[PDB]
Symmetry: none
Subunit: 79 residues, 4 copies
């Protein structure tokens, strides 16, 4: 299927949820630091949001953008 934002976020979400479940909700929820209670608000609201962030970040940039960034940075780093 074509690359779709909603769809990639979902894919990421499932992959994160998988890992979490393999390492155990409780074990990870603590290894991270969220009240054993918040796990629900967590799994239902942030994971999706984080997933979307990861999807957007992976969607990334194109050569033109990088080149522009390189020039802009080069300018700030010159005397």
């Amino acid at each position: 299927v074509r690359a779709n934002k909603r769809n990639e976020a979902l894919r990421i979400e499932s992959a994160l949820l998988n890992k979490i479940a393999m390492l155990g909700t409780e074990k990870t929820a603590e290894a991270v630091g969220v009240d054993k209670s918040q796990i629900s608000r967590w799994k239902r609201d942030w994971i999706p949001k984080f997933s979307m962030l990861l999807a957007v970040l992976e969607w990334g940039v194109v050569d033109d953008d990088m080149a522009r960034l390189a020039r802009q940075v080069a300018a700030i780093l010159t005397n």
Copy 2:
């Protein structure tokens, strides 16, 4: 301890990418309200980074490396 550093390494990579895309644009694409951007970066990214470290999620800062090179070039010529 191992996760602490990894967490920070991941955070940096995430923060770097967000910067390469633009904080404003990224926030918009991700659905985080402009008013939350700060809370987003000082609080949530770090948390998510730890999760990613615990989950042993693969994260690389290749983009920052590439940009550093490209910049190092235009800086010499």
Copy 3:
């Protein structure tokens, strides 16, 4: 593509930090009463912003700054 953009781009950047700082000092720094500091930002910031743009004032945004440091940190090995 011109100065109006630049002026805006600087105005934001200012407004961002003018709050990311607090209208307690922002009020002080300009010898302006705090019961008007909000109005003042409307009547002047845009002006001052155009001035800075005209003067070709070097204003770097948080993303470029970060990228610069990360790049520097890489290059300075």
Copy 4:
């Protein structure tokens, strides 16, 4: 140094740019009455200069300058 000296340092740089562009060229390119250039250099520019000092503009500029040097060093 402190705020007052950082303001003055800002002010002077602003005035310098304004002098290189012409007090009247910039006067309009900005959009202020050619008569108001008076109040601007002796009233508002100082104020604005303090603000930029407080908002720490330049502290970033200094940092970037430093980095640019340290980079230029290890570079060539």
